[PDB]
Amino acid sequence: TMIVIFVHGWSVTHTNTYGELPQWLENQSKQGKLDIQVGNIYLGRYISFDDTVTVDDIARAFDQAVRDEIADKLRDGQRFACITHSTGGPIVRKWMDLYFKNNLAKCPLSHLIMLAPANHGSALAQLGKSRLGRIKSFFEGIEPGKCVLDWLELGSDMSWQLNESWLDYDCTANGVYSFVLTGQKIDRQFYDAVNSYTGESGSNGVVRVAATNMNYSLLKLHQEGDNGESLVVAKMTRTQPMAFGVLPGLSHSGKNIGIIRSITMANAATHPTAIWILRCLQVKSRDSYNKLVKELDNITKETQKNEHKEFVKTLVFTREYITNRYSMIIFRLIDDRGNHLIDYDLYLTAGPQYSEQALPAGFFVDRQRNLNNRGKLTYFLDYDIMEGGINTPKMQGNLGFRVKAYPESSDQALAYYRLLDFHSSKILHPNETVMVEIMLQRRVDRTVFRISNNLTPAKISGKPTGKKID
Amino acid sequence: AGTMIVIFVHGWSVTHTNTYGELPQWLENQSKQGKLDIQVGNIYLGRYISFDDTVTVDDIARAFDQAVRDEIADKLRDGQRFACITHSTGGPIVRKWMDLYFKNNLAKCPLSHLIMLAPANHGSALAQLGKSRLGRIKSFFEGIEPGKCVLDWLELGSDMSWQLNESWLDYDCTANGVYSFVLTGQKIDRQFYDAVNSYTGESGSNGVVRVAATNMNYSLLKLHQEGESLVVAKMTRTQPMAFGVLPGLSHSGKNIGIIRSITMANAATHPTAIWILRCLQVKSRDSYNKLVKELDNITKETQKNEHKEFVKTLVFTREYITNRYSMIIFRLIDDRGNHLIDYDLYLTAGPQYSEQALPAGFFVDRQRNLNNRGKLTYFLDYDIMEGGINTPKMQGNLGFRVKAYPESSDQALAYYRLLDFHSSLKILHPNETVMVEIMLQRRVDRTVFRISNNLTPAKISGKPTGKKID
Amino acid sequence: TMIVIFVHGWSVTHTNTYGELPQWLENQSKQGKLDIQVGNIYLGRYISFDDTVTVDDIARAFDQAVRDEIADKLRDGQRFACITHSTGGPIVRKWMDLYFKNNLAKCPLSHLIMLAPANHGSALAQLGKSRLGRIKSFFEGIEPGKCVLDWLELGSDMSWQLNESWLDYDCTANGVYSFVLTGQKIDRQFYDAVNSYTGESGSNGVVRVAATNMNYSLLKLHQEGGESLVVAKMTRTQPMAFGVLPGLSHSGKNIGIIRSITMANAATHPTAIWILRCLQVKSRDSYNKLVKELDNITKETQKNEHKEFVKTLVFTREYITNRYSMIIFRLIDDRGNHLIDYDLYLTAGPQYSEQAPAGFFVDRQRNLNNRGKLTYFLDYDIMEGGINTPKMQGNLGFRVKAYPESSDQALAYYRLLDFHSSKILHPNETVMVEIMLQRRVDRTVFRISNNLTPAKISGKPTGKKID
Amino acid sequence: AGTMIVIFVHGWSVTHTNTYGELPQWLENQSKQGKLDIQVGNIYLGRYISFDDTVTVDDIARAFDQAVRDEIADKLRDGQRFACITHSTGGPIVRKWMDLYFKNNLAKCPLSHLIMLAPANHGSALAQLGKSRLGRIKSFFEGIEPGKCVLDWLELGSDMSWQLNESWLDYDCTANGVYSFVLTGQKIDRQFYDAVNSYTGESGSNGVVRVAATNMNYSLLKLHQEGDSLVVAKMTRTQPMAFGVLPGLSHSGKNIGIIRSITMANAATHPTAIWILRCLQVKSRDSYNKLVKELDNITKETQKNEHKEFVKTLVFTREYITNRYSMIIFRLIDDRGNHLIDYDLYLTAGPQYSEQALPAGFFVDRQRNLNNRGKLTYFLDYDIMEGGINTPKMQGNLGFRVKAYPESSDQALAYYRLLDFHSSLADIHKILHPNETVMVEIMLQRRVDRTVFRISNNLTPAKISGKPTGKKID
Lengths: 470, 470, 467, 474
Ligand SMILES: NC(=O)c1ccc[n+]([C@@H]2O[C@H](COP(=O)([O-])OP(=O)(O)OC[C@H]3O[C@@H](n4cnc5c(N)ncnc54)[C@H](O)[C@@H]3O)[C@@H](O)[C@H]2O)c1
Ligand SMILES: NC(=O)c1ccc[n+]([C@@H]2O[C@H](COP(=O)([O-])OP(=O)(O)OC[C@H]3O[C@@H](n4cnc5c(N)ncnc54)[C@H](O)[C@@H]3O)[C@@H](O)[C@H]2O)c1
Ligand SMILES: NC(=O)c1ccc[n+]([C@@H]2O[C@H](COP(=O)([O-])OP(=O)(O)OC[C@H]3O[C@@H](n4cnc5c(N)ncnc54)[C@H](O)[C@@H]3O)[C@@H](O)[C@H]2O)c1
Fold this sequence. Notes:
The PDB classes it as hydrolase. The structure is a homotetramer. Chain A is of the alpha/beta class. The first copy, chain A, folds into two domains: 3-213 and 240-309, Rossmann fold (3-Layer(aba) Sandwich); 326-447, Sandwich (Immunoglobulin-like). Chain A is 23% helix and 25% strand. Chain A has helices spanning 21-29, 55-76, 88-100, 130-133, 146-152, 157-165, 209-212, 272-281, 286-306, 383-390; strands at 3-7, 41-46, 80-85, 109-115, 177-182, 217-223, 232-238, 243-246, 309-313, 318-322, 326-335, 344-349, 364-369, 376-382, 399-405, 415-416, 420-424, 432-440, 443-444, 449-452. In chain A, the strands form five sheets. In chain A, strands 2-1-3-4-5-8 form a six-stranded parallel β-sheet, with helices on both faces. A six-stranded mixed β-sheet of chain A has the order 7-6-18-11-14-13. Chain A has a three-stranded antiparallel β-sheet with strand order 12-15-17, with no helix packed on it. In chain A, helix 2 packs across helix 3. The first copy, chain A, is globular, with a radius of gyration of 25 Å. Chains in contact: A-B, A-D, B-C, C-D. The interface between A and B is large, with 63 and 65 residues. Strand 20 of chain C pairs antiparallel with strand 2 (43-48) of chain D. One nicotinamide-adenine-dinucleotide (NAD) sits between chains D (346-348, 355-358, 360-363, 366) and A (186, 188, 191, 193-196, 199).
């Protein structure tokens, strides 16, 4: 009654990317642990190395591939589970959005198990097609498709569109049980030295675990107050809870410790991914699901506690690597007129007074700005260093945002924005991404247009009246 | 329930209200003699900022609303309505202001008349030349360089002018007690022909804006591909509006500026002053109809007399041929929502429409928009087109052929197929622009995603099936 | 006692680009009309469709291929003749410049016959790699190397550099006999409706007649000086054989200048005819008589091809092809900078009015990598006809103004230059026009004062200039 | 029969001559007390335009010569020479001036002393930050946005910076009676730190210029790829110049600006006033060489006292570590004249020269020039590196590895070969010196395969194969 479909990631050119997990599940079903008839396990192959192919298209082609091989079985009423890796995750989420956003109860997918999904993007996607194809994790010279890489770029418009659309989902309430499994171990033998993201703390060498999590909040900040005063009003929303687990000592790819690539028949019984793939596949109820959620999070705590400090030693060097728990902000800033702000300055603030110079030492990990939509900003931060120094008596747990959009207020300004200030701290969570959309009031001065019945001609002064228009 | 207000609106790079010539002084006196009902002090000079890089057209239209309320909110509340006499970009400004504030209830927009002097309603070919290069041109000597965002508005094939004009397809000013008129000229002030820029003397233009781009009588043909490839044509058209081409008038200049060259002494004989007075005297649909025919007659008289111009000097003899012209603005997208940038576009003619059968001399110019490279503005010679195509061996045919890439090939995976629209005398009209939005069928090959239950790992072939997906 | 090597053009993937001319030169030699041993005819094949391969690469490679195959025969005192087509011409010209610039008496090349070389560039190159590859004749969809396009875009730095070096050449005096043979016929099937250059008058569909000629002048105008102003300096290459053959396009089996040559039509093919004559030249006299005969063929061809009437059951059209002139402008200043923002004017008439003949202009192009290189394409006949009249006194000049202009605030600017002359233009010829502007800096850019009381720094110009 | 003349020239962003603090009046009164021989009226305040986009550094140098000739022509004719005291970009400008008029006859240059305070001789990391972002920085609150041509010059690894400073390799200021000096500081004025641009508080700088960029004791390093892969290296170095890292001084600001904070009430105890007065008194090869010995001593003590700073407010406690750093400026060309832009560069250390063996914390910052993509400037911590490399297990080794593209592959036709260079932190002939910039020019051997051109006398037409021969052409 159960069908299983594997979906790989980008820059994949061989179906052994799935390791030996497919054979395992078929072999496990033969022993009564799964109800998968012979021939109901499918290996998915899709073309991710084409510059002309967008993400939507592959989601359209996935639909065509599903109806093609198993329309008869879906008519009988079987439903399938999705075990994806890397881009496969976002692809299937798009396919669901393209075909079942508002009738998920009638979607033929029964389970969706995502392995290290770049649900909120990969920092390396901005590196390009050629500079990143050189990294042996892809290899060829110029590997993955440009349009796939536009999607995965941090602060991507399409990424925001699909994830804000997914804010409304309720998979559990509709009989769809989704999960996310990821690791935070760097396969240090493949660290590209002149591309630090490959050994970034908080990642498996490719995707940051905070980008894997499907538990995230959208925070909308609207500027108000006429010419003073009131200013910012906040409204926050959150996805439905999803089973989230950071498993121990598993990187993104590679036979050695690849989250899926490292699965063999011999080690499947003790492979964290193999073990938990199955337990998720076994879910058939709401209580079973929620018991798996509270089990997975417990593991997440354990692995991130056990992988906090690492001492690797060669005959040449001695090194300690610190891996904490992290967070991610995707900032979008628009205005009340439809323009997308691209020129601005954004500050995190803290202290009794919400000063931009007060955040604890070491709060920052990385700042990236999207190439196509420049006005999108993705910050990568150390939640543990922050929360540690944030939550004290004389800092009071404060954290805020200050956007200085441009052009700024001046004695000659005619269309400009004002300083926006927000004071809070719950915005950030460990191993979580946050989407902050900040809407500013575009302020046009009355001088931009004036009328006077003084019919004696005169020069048109660019003299601002210092008074805004309604 | 009685009285008339008049508000003048100038054009771009205007820094002095003498841009309006002496037309305000004239109308005040004409109303004093009983030819209009305009109380003393109800004629207004508008002055807005067009030389600011930060100020948008939306900004100015919004600022116009505040300027109106700021000065004549009381009178409007008394049941008074104003007539906007606009010049150049002032027209696009006022149209945008009706769209922002009163589209779906024009019946009580405070505007009763809109007389539009030489407005780049469908853009100005000069805009793409740039800010610095244009400020140095003889058409811009009288002011400062133009705003970057204003220039983004008047660029041929611009998105904003497209958005505004498609919205104006649904307008109906006449039925709502709003009488709009467009008046322009087609004479080149040859003393201001920029040498290294032919647009400043382009036939069918007044040195700045093309006659066809001033007309508000335009169509929108949406051509959708279906499929053996098929095409479905659907066209709509604006409501009839008064349109006049007056004799021997340029865009600006004290010599023959359509409004700039109006003095107290020459107003009685000035074509602009005469017909502006007539237009303001309309208070009925029948009066509107009568003016429509009378104005069209002036267009045919004007374009008959100005067909040839003989310039002789002690140094050279020259003949200038100004005919009647047509304009297209092509938009090209696909059925998945993407906006296409790479395509080849053909006009067709003959028995079954060869791209090489067009009459010699059909072409005047084409321009590709800088921000949307998929927007194509063609400028053609309707006389020569119609003259050759409406013959027995030509059978009065015309069509479009679009070749968008990636094209069909063994490289397929993702591509488009040719479109052939087969039509016409109608698509073209003299002194008229037409918007041709063509929706393509994006085809995806099935190997873009396939699933197979053969658990034996294998390489992933990028070879298309030759069969598209749904 | 002679070797022949064929060199092809860009986007060529098959040796048949040379038509059947190679077998024709082997048979003509066997009949006693040339002294070529059997096996001394060579087909050169170089890669032009690789984005990473440069013209410098291909030249360096030509030398290695020559040495790899005929080092034996070259030391035995044989020397070879190169018959080039399209970009193959510039390639040999570059090789020539890499290994035998200072001593053409020791170069193994004895003859160079160039078939429609875009020696001064091709207007098509700017169209891009993708757009050009879609032209059915060369069809593929993205084809030629981008570095090849960089060399062959009008006004490119490299072709400019190679050809400035060529004002110092004199192949004939060094025993080397050079030739340019081209046509001006449009193969009208290959006309691309979205790219009008494909039928441009004054071209063979790809190369303009004035772009293949090696008879050009490099005119240098140095603005000196409140006033005083212009100084002119013109240098010109040594004479070369230039022939415009009848009824031949760039490529295609129908009327390709070399591609349409067959075993059966070679005797009447204008190319095969004059290729044999060019190879038979062996002295100053043979070269000079050949030169003038090509001049007669050029005037005969261009007089018969002035008007062409094409006929179809759907339309009847008339094609007028005149003789055209190309100017290539280079604009720098007395400091080494390359000027990008400026307006350029042709001026004519008694007062040299930039506003003064109708139809003078055909095309203008701005190079994509060097923004300051401006290429004119002009109708010489219409030009000469309108200016060499009583009321226009045959005058022709330039005017340039680089930005910043002299302004109320300008501190680093340029002064208008005005050249008066006319010989700059000749039909079927390109002229390279380098203009050195005088960069003027106002003193306010730097002042010193012993008034030690601090004060704000005003940037208002003093109205004076620094040395 | 003369006295000396002194001319101040400021840096970029300067709209007011108070940028020089009160140093000029101090030098006037100090001369009045017999400590200098400056006649009244022989001290000049220079003002050049740094905020105009149309104005290049070459135009500033040109204008300086005209200004000097406009004001003190007959003074210089009568046998007088002037001392230059510069701050920020004024340093390079004068250096550009000397190069335009006296490159190879410094014995005939009217300048007798050059005292540069915070010259971005090798550029400022802030220059890459466009002239719009940079005018928003609170430091130059009083100043307006730069001219773009000054930025292009100040940008790290700019071609024009490489040219002037490469021409300065053959200078010998001391041997021609010209006494030049570099006196900088490394204090961060923590009050004006722009939190959106961390360079403004970068360790190893004063807020604008890194200590490695000020110094004129630098080396040019050439690595020529040879073989039929072997490397041949040629190192060249400038003549010793006075170098001083003075204590507790930032770039600008009346609080602790190296020159902006100078008043007459604090001049007697201002390190910059003390040492400038000493430089101006140099009148021999002897006094000069012993003045640089003194500056080396102060440079040392300054960086030992400023290694650790602790700022304590009621809200937070912080500790800032500042060590000694070195700047590598990479230029990459090939033997054909082309400029290699696409490549990757690995510093390698330890036995067997592994890229993955560099000492932890070796790196501070990397920047790729905007106008010339082939220029790579690395900013490195010398102490952490020298500490980790000059140990038994590391054998004191440091090398370079550049790959260059296209690389060796089945593509081939025109490609490049791996360059492996080995040497350094030995203290005998090392490549990195503390508080120093090093210039590294990398020439790769462009390799073309024989398939790019073949000839054959088999006259039967055939398809042309782009299949690489795997063998190269000379
Ligand atoms: N590359 C990474 O792994 C990484 C790490 C941290 C942050 N980021 C951030 O991602 C964004 C893009 O990364 P980026 O590397 O292009 O920015 P960058 O500032 O680090 O480098 C800019 C350019 O210089 C190149 N370059 C840097 N070091 C080089 C070296 N040793 N050899 C050859 N080329 C070298 C880079 O490839 C890039 O083209 C930036 O915001 C950056 O701060 C990237
Ligand atoms: N800006 C600095 O102080 C700094 C510090 C260290 C290294 N660098 C290096 O200098 C080079 C260029 O500097 P960069 O800052 O442009 O590179 P970057 O990678 O840090 O940022 C790239 C773009 O994102 C913008 N941006 C980043 N954070 C922002 C924020 N909070 N608010 C508004 N805009 C923000 C930046 O202005 C920039 O346009 C890079 O190689 C970079 O790695 C810069
Ligand atoms: N195998 C791994 O997992 C791993 C992880 C981190 C660092 N390392 C290695 O440890 C050593 C110390 O690095 P770190 O942790 O102090 O800082 P880092 O590795 O985070 O590097 C900091 C910056 O310098 C770049 N860089 C790193 N190594 C380089 C090299 N050999 N050559 C040129 N650029 C390089 C990086 O891309 C980054 O921009 C490096 O050799 C580094 O390659 C290895």
